[PDB]
Scaffold this active site. Sequence first.
Site, PDB file in Angstrom:
ATOM      1  N   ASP A 263       0.895  -1.213   0.000  1.00 33.04           N
ATOM      2  CA  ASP A 263       0.000   0.000   0.000  1.00 33.04           C
ATOM      3  C   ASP A 263       0.864   1.171   0.000  1.00 33.04           C
ATOM      4  OD1 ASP A 263      -1.690   2.107   0.334  1.00 33.04           O
ATOM      5  OD2 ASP A 263      -2.736   1.335   2.016  1.00 33.04           O
TER       6      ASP A 263
ATOM      7  N   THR B 208      -2.748   5.348  -4.609  1.00 38.22           N
ATOM      8  CA  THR B 208      -1.628   5.718  -3.751  1.00 38.22           C
ATOM      9  C   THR B 208      -0.297   5.615  -4.483  1.00 38.22           C
ATOM     10  OG1 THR B 208      -1.448   3.462  -2.866  1.00 38.22           O
ATOM     11  CG2 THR B 208      -2.864   5.009  -1.677  1.00 38.22           C
ATOM     12  N   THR B 209      -0.238   4.824  -5.556  1.00 40.41           N
ATOM     13  CA  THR B 209       0.967   4.772  -6.376  1.00 40.41           C
ATOM     14  C   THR B 209       0.854   5.694  -7.583  1.00 40.41           C
ATOM     15  OG1 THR B 209       1.424   2.480  -5.713  1.00 40.41           O
ATOM     16  CG2 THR B 209       2.512   3.296  -7.703  1.00 40.41           C
TER      17      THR B 209
ATOM     18  N   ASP C  95      -8.927  -1.257   0.879  1.00 40.40           N
ATOM     19  CA  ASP C  95      -9.026  -0.762  -0.490  1.00 40.40           C
ATOM     20  C   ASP C  95     -10.258  -1.316  -1.190  1.00 40.40           C
ATOM     21  OD1 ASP C  95      -6.705   0.612  -0.124  1.00 40.40           O
ATOM     22  OD2 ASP C  95      -5.472  -0.642  -1.318  1.00 40.40           O
TER      23      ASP C  95
END
Lengths: 49, 535, 490, 78, 100, 523, 71
Positions: free
Chosen positions: B68, B101-102, B399
Amino acid sequence: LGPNGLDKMMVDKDGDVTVTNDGATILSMMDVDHQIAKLMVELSKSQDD
Amino acid sequence: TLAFDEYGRPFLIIKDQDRKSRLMGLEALKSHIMAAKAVANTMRTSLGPNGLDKMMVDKDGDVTVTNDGATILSMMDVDHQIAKLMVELSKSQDDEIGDGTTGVVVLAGALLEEAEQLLDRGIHPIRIADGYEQAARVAIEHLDKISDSVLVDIKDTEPLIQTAKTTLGSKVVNSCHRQMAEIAVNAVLTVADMERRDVDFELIKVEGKVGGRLEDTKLIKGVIVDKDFSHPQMPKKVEDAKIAILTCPFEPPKPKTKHKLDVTSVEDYKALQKYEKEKFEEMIQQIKETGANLAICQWGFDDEANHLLLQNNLPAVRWVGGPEIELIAIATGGRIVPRFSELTAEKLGFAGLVQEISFGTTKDKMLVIEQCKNSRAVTIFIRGGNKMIIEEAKRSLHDALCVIRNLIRDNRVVYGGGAAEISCALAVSQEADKCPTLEQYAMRAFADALEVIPMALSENSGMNPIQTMTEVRARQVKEMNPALGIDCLHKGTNDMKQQHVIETLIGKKQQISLATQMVRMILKIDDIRKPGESE
Amino acid sequence: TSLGPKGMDKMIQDGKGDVTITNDGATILKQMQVLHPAARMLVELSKAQDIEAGDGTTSVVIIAGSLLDSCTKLLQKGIHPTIISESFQKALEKGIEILTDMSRPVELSDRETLLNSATTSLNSKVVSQYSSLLSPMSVNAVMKVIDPATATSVDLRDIKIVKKLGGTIDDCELVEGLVLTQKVSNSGITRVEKAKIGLIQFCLSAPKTDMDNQIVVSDYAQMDRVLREERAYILNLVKQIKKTGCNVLLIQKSILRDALSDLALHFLNKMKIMVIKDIEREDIEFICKTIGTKPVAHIDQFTADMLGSAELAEEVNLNGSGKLLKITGCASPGKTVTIVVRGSNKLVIEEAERSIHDALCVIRCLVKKRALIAGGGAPEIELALRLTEYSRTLSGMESYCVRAFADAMEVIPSTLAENAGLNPISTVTELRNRHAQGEKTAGINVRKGGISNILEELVVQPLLVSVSALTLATETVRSILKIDDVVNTR
Amino acid sequence: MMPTPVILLKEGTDSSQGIPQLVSNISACQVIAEAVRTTLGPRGMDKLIVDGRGKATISNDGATILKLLDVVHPAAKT
Amino acid sequence: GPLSVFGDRSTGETIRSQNVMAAASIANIVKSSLGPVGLDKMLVDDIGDVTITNDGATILKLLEVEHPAAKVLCELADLQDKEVGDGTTSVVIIAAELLK
Amino acid sequence: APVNIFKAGADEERAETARLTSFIGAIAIGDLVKSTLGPKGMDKILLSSGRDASLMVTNDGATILKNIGVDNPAAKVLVDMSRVQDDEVGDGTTSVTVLAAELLREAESLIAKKIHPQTIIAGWREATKAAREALLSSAVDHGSDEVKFRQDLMNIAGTTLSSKLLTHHKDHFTKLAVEAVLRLKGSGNLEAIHIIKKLGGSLADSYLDEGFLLDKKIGVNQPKRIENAKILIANTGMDTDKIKIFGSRVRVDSTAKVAEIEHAEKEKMKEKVERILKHGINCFINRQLIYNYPEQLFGAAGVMAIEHADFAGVERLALVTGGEIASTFDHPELVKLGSCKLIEEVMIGEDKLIHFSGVALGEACTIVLRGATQQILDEAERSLHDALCVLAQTVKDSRTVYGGGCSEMLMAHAVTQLANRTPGKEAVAMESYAKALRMLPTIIADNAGYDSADLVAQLRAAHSEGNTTAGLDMREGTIGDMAILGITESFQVKRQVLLSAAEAAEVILRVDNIIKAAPRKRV
Amino acid sequence: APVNIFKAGADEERAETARLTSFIGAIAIGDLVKSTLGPKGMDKILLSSGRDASLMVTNDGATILKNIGVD
């Protein structure tokens, strides 16, 4: 001791490295700090001579 | 010069000026972009189905392995004022949407990287920032063109399960690729408010206990608390529970103010002994008169109470916490009763089988509720063979729960796998030449930056980015643009309609908008005044 | 920021206290003392230009750095270094043919090409405002000593530089004779007209053999037989010189023996023979070519055959950092010339020396290859456009690597526009449009402030500079892309 | 070496006077102005200043820049 | 990132400002000794040797300078003595103002 | 050992870390140079700590290892091995280094199986003999029919050079190597082919000088160019002869005798030069320096003289001019002269060199090496030295083997087929020998980036059923015929790689105990 | 990452030693308890340097590992 024995690697004070079979060289290159152990080294030397 | 004037005297403007640093030029701008490259190089390694994990070692020696990005970037020791903002970018995406998040770091980094050539071409730093707005509007407008959904949130939850599979596919819980996808759907739809499209995060609790395997993770239609029956010989099974939720200790009532009872005579001493005994009997009978057969108390018990609980066949547990009695009362349809004398049958909770579970050699004694009546709260019970997979499983299901909530908020979706990003890059390129007044270089740079995602995905998938990108971009032009993406195993063809790679529309809309704004606020800087050593 | 006529100079101070100001990129890099193992390769690159061309010294580095930078977007796409190296090789082989398209053949008899090329090289120098003098001097310094139309090489080591403090650049000289820093003794002559000049290596002092010599005195008058004989010996040496018919002596410095005794100079001063002393063993080669004298090792061979000529040999009384000797005019002058450098400050004089050599190297290139091309960025725009057309016909990874080589070509006309105060976004675009239309002689005109005809402005560069710049830069970076493992030894 | 009485008037006080003091005072004002020279107009840039807490402020308003410069010169404070 | 030069490198307006200061620090020495209304200086070295003068040449020969921009003005004064022999005060004053 | 220590300042390791640290330290040597094996490998830069760091870029394993400064007493064993390979044949230094390392890696794995170290050594001795026969039976001979022999020299030169900087310049430097050796037609001195390094131009601009170049330009007062010159070389004294009497002084009554003796001193120097000139010469080269006096005499005679071209320069001139050292001149009729066409000076890289062109019996040559940078010049020079060293031996022993991994698979095949005929106690060790032999074509493919999983399987499958010429095609990434492609290696180079790795590797296996003497000069 | 490090007192390792040191540590645990596998295994002596050295002899792998203090 004997034909099935293993050899020693001696590292000299100047960095030279020798792999030795004979007892005279093996013991002569050791920094022995004992009065009787040195005599046992001398025994091997006499036999070599 | 500082500390030396033309007259030989010292020249001092600001405190400790000899320990400061200032460098403006184009060097502040190149330093900001260069520092961002160090950040982008980190997150690009965990993008896509083959994304690699990070091991984070905390200051106290604790270690956790996670995928994450919210857990990776939040544990950094980077002392750079702009790199810290790159973390805030991932935070804003995590708070609003909870998916990319990436992505927002990789995209924002590409915009900073591609901007490097624009400064070297002599384009004013601010004109670059404005040029990205003209191109970003094009990508956003086209992003909303291709979208469709058949999700009704009633029974046809097939595309909703598929969305959960797309999200979970990137996590370390693919051994439960189906099982956790179904748990996440059932957890939200049983508590979501269809009237307003609101989902209350407090109605889904996530618990866990070390041991077993991921396949043993279950959704419990009820509440799980730490059970500790005050009487060790009390029966541990209730078939039909009539639950009294009480926030008063089982001891004689005392005033809250200073009391200091005056006892003078022996008749006073002995009379009090009798009155106190009666208080212990009344407080228990006041429960039985309501038909209750299980009491749950925020406070503890007196030794006298435990015996009366036994003789009246009235099981009870002790020291149940604030949020636990709050959730129990709601889940069971009851109310919290202040005192013993205010007890009434109308405030009792209704539940089915009440049992405690023993786990191996330990004494955890966890609650399970089997049946309930129109409960609006659920509990997830996560198992696992080690502490790390359980904590990562908590984030993996988080998520999955978040993207379900996002579809409830807005049921418009897009095709993933890079199809949306490549299509946007092509759309911007087509309009980048309408019209090349001043911004031709900047708008093309934006279009190129959009491709950082299918390119990084291709690298992590083991493909050459030139051989992959040139084929897909050609195929999307030679024919009416299909939802053509990329994958590692190809799964036959790369038709996203057949692979069922589903992503939320509002997710990507935020990724583009938030990444663009973050880039702007760090380009339009040409002076950093950070202090050096203390002395 | 040191590229083109509008560029600026840099100051570098070493740890000893030697402060220099220079424009030449090669002299900047040698003083920066860059430590990084990868960037030091650029210092060696600039060194080769100093040998091969002499004036290719800045553009070779900006090209090499740009070629390496152009490889980042290739490596970040997974293109194997061996693919990039072969692709740049092919781009080089085509680039050189493109350059020949702009060439114009010339002959060494064309005074205008020679003056224009020498002037061009001075536009970026601190003496660019003295080009009306230094330019015909730079051409005359070379074209008279290389025997034009008999050779295809120039050895510039026969053009000597003499540096004095005083005056200004307008006071520089291109004397065709011999300039010496040696002193004259005695100073009672200071000028000789219609001189015969001789070069002597014989020591005009007491006799001495290779063997240890001892004189033994064993009597009263024996000491006087020594003193009277040594006086006669030295006088006899002077008589051989005087009877020859010489006027001026050039005396080579001796170490083991005294070359000039007090008695030898005593007779020579009375016989009105002017003596120039302390000439180094390394100076006689230039003297022998310039004046035409021959050394005599044994005094008995000192005859007329070893004497030269000079119309005027005089000491030049300067008001600055001392004085010098000047011998002007002789029979059959040799293939030598001296340039005397003036200036108010030592920093200017040292830079002037490099600028003089930079101009001298221009003709050296033009003798090796009698072909020039337009400057002002014209061949760089031509390469960028033609190499793009080349890449449009390629396939596979070469279609992405060859265009990267071409992309690097624009770094020079972009830099030239920026340094001149022009907007490179419109300047470079207009340059690429004009050349695409066919204006092969269009380029950056730093005097007008725009784009105009390069040939009308007489801004012309030898073909060899653009050919060598790509050859040496390309080979260097194709090697750098091959070295990929740093090992720190123990 | 001049103010060497057997008894001092005050203690150890620094005192400047005349033309170099006025030039110094004007010079201090010219230097502090540099903090805002690039903030004027629709195309001005922002500044990033870090305080002793480690927190940065990004702004371009003179009323926020001048208060964070830690000015000590008596004249620049004007 | 940065150059691997082991010293200290300053570019742009840093050196363009410093050279003006260094030049002024030299002109400020001789400006006060121009004309019959000027006054003399006393130069005292570290060991106690006292020199009285008011000429720009002797003063700048005896006083040590460090900045490379200041050595230029010192050399200018030395050249005036060689070429002319006198007037060695206005060449430093005028030259410094040309830079300003 | 650690209990009851009786040593002064020394230490020892036995049976626990002695072998562990020996295997780790020695095997690491292979991984260092592993990347340099094959035609697609990358090069290294080696850096010093400072004090004129003298940066070196190189590929060859011998130049890498000899500058590392290995401190581990066991790793030094393989470093000395790579030195010997460089001294004997001058090629394959990477191959023998990585082969020995792979053998040692397998030995550690065999110790983990509780196989006695003497059993492992015994197995490798039998496997080594099997491999030696594979090389003997597969050698390719070349005798007469010079049109085929010359092709072999071109193949050997191309193979060696393909692994060095001189990659895409093969069409220039292959001929510089093969033809320079063939022109010598004599002893492989490896000094008759001189290389001059100049900056300027590209590597492709290098050329072979048909004649001989000298330093030390033609005098002061001497002719600069003579056609059809007769050349005399010398090793005698020009001045300060001090003829052979030690402790002799001139002791006279007056200075008149000193002047008379001084004349005699010059008269004998005049006679000496005349005795040389009676030879009838145009060019004179003397090892010892020329002083002002004989320089005038040679100039007046119209004869040039070169001083101190080099210490060995006169010896090299003797071989390329066909003369004799002539340190003494007392019988001119017994002294042989050389002959050439031109003695003119030429300009090479802005440096005037004396060019002896058209020299009779010119059994020597000079290669003029041009490059852009000093690192290019130094590595390119080494590439020429390596190729010339192998070629100077190939022309003496014409036996070659097939390269590209062909020889390695043939050796591994012989070891495998015989290992399967031996009892398991030893077969496990013989198989490990063959596994190491197969690592070499694996490393070569892995450095290039080829799918070694298929090239190794296909190559082994090919050699399992005939196809004794099969090997790696490093251009396409497949298996090809080495004879058609023309990929061959010198027999002697391959023999020594096999024998040296086996002999050196035993040194490590035999040691169970390291005793380290107290260090000196460490404070 | 190793070039232009922006970390205060922290560091990171990638692609080279990150996996190597992970494998070294994992095997180091295995080699410790390897001697206790099977019915003929040997027992260990666990002791601290002092402050109630708490000398314990143990065989079980979990009891061994929970008293080592792996860093």
